[PDB]
């Protein structure tokens, strides 16, 4: 689902919707939510109540415009599981950082934006904020149980802003080699941040999820909020 009448360009042209919500208290910080691999769904819905609830502004833009605008696949139902994959591995990585950082130079701008933009990404949405935290575009970047991020380590040193990933312990995406990987390539520089959730899995900060634990998540969410509240007037 969608925010009708929303509508952002990337520098290419291309144009996509976004659902947003705004706090009551504004001018405020946005953060924009790079979704995973379901679209716009009622994650996404819940990931901006959660945020508005901070007091912040939410935007999570829809990046499969570019192949089938507005969906919105169910986790729960494996044909749209399938449908889900089946986008995620036609998905366009560079047009979706392209995509995303049209979408924070539009949360910098809109009513409600105090000029300070965040990015929050789940999964797919966790891999594409660290590649949108290497490019600089936000003010901070926060990523969970991104996958493949053991493939970007050389973008490591060109991260110049802060960027906070959570990971499962237990998430088979991320293997021990890759966790290993991970951990000492991002050791090098202390604008990035990456704990392991060692009783944790894929998905674990979803409660509808089969993965969800909420230990981990109630820490991660406090640490991402602890994160982007220095965006905060």
Not at 81 to 92: G, P, V
Not at 165 to 181: T, Y
Request: glycine letters at 10%.
């Amino acid at each position: 689902m969608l925010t009708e009448g929303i509508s952002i360009q990337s520098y290419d042209g291309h144009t996509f919707g976004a659902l947003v919500g705004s706090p009551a208290k504004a001018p405020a910080p946005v953060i924009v939510i790079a979704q995973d691999i379901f679209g716009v769904n009622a994650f996404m819905r819940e990931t901006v109540s959660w945020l508005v609830d901070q007091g912040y502004a939410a935007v999570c833009p829809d990046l499969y415009a570019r192949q089938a605008p507005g969906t919105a696949l169910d986790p729960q139902d494996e044909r749209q599981r399938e449908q889900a994959y089946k986008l995620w591995q036609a998905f366009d990585m560079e047009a979706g950082v392209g995509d995303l950082e049209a979408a924070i130079r539009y949360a910098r701008h809109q009513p409600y934006s105090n000029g300070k933009v965040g990015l929050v990404g789940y999964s797919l949405g966790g891999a594409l904020a660290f590649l949108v935290a290497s490019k600089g575009y936000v003010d901070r970047a926060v990523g969970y149980y991104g996958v493949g991020l053991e493939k970007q380590l050389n973008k490591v040193p060109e991260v110049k802003h802060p960027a906070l990933f959570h990971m499962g312990g237990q998430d088979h995406f991320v293997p021990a080699p890759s966790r290993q990987l991970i951990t000492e390539g991002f050791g090098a520089n202390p604008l990035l941040q990456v704990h392991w959730y060692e009783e944790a899995g894929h998905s674990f900060a979803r409660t509808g999820s089969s993965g969800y634990v909420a230990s981990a998540a109630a820490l991660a969410n406090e640490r991402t909020l602890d994160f982007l509240v220095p965006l905060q007037s």
